[PDB]
Write a protein that binds this ligand. Sequence first.
Ligand SMILES: NC(=O)c1ccc[n+]([C@@H]2O[C@H](COP(=O)([O-])OP(=O)(O)OC[C@H]3O[C@@H](n4cnc5c(N)ncnc54)[C@H](OP(=O)(O)O)[C@@H]3O)[C@@H](O)[C@H]2O)c1
Ligand SMILES: NC(=O)[C@H]1C[C@]2(NC(=O)NC2=O)c2cc(F)ccc2O1
Length: 316
Amino acid sequence: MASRILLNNGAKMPILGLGTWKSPPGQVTEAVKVAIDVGYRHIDCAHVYQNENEVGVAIQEKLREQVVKREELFIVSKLWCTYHEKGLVKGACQKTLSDLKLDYLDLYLIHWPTGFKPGKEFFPLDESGNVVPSDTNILDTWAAMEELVDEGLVKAIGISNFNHLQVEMILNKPGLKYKPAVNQIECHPYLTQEKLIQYCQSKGIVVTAYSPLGSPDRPWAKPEDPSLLEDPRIKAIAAKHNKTTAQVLIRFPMQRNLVVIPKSVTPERIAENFKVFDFELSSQDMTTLLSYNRNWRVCALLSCTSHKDYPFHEEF
Ligand SMILES: NC(=O)c1ccc[n+]([C@@H]2O[C@H](COP(=O)([O-])OP(=O)(O)OC[C@H]3O[C@@H](n4cnc5c(N)ncnc54)[C@H](OP(=O)(O)O)[C@@H]3O)[C@@H](O)[C@H]2O)c1
Ligand SMILES: NC(=O)[C@H]1C[C@]2(NC(=O)NC2=O)c2cc(F)ccc2O1
């Protein structure tokens, strides 16, 4: 299968990337170095993950070592919710660039459609405990993102956790200069997202699937939540193809024409997770995995359910 998908900005994005949420700062430099050594060319980052400096140390080393050229890498980061104000977006991008040791990003995403009050706290909640919003409109945030393209700091802009109509708001924004290239959303067999994927693909927007393994290291997991890596039905499909459960869970979105970004800091698993271009799931396998949908989310942003722009009220 082809390793890179064409974006609506004319650049090609690797369909397999390395995730870095929850990767410890003491382990993520080695994790990104090993990932680049074994073939990965896309790294998914975010300022709110608090490890971009350490990701940058790895990228910089592999670039200086001439293990890879900058043009061959596809580096993604995300604008955090406390920087939606027009006057804060460039600084937020520039801090990410400085941390990552880069002079441009390949793709910069609005991390959530929800803007929060600016300040040192990433989740600034009022005496009572609810997120304090910003009044900045997300069409104005989008215009600020478009300026980053026109200034050369980013080659592509996109969105993340946007529901279908929020996508629609962006796409219908008066004066729209650049369409979003990507919508990065949670997607796996327990949250299959057919409606939202269809809408986005129909518009030339590429979808990236996050938490493709079900995020077993998510901070709020409970023993009684479903577990994709332990699902006997998924292990059965993996056994049939002589692959691991993780490899099936990574190959599944690839065959829906999605980009996928599994996280690991374990060198053996980083390597294993990339070995997904040598087998094919059947259509029957694909439909069977889709049938496991239960609308179950890893990331529901539970402190923001009353924000004007909370995304997960809408069906899709
Ligand atoms: N846009 C957003 O709002 C958003 C939200 C969530 C996630 N994301 C992105 O998506 C990435 C992936 O999602 P995620 O971090 O939630 O979870 P994930 O990729 O679904 O799962 C990560 C977990 O799976 C384990 N693991 C990886 N490979 C494995 C294998 N081959 N066998 C067994 N276990 C394996 C990892 O363990 P070890 O690391 O210990 O090996 C880790 O505990 C993130 O890191 C982030 O980059 C973005
Ligand atoms: N479940 C949620 O709603 C998650 C999302 C998230 N995970 C992720 O990758 N991007 C994100 O917003 C995350 C990351 C953080 F550093 C802090 C909070 C948090 O809430």
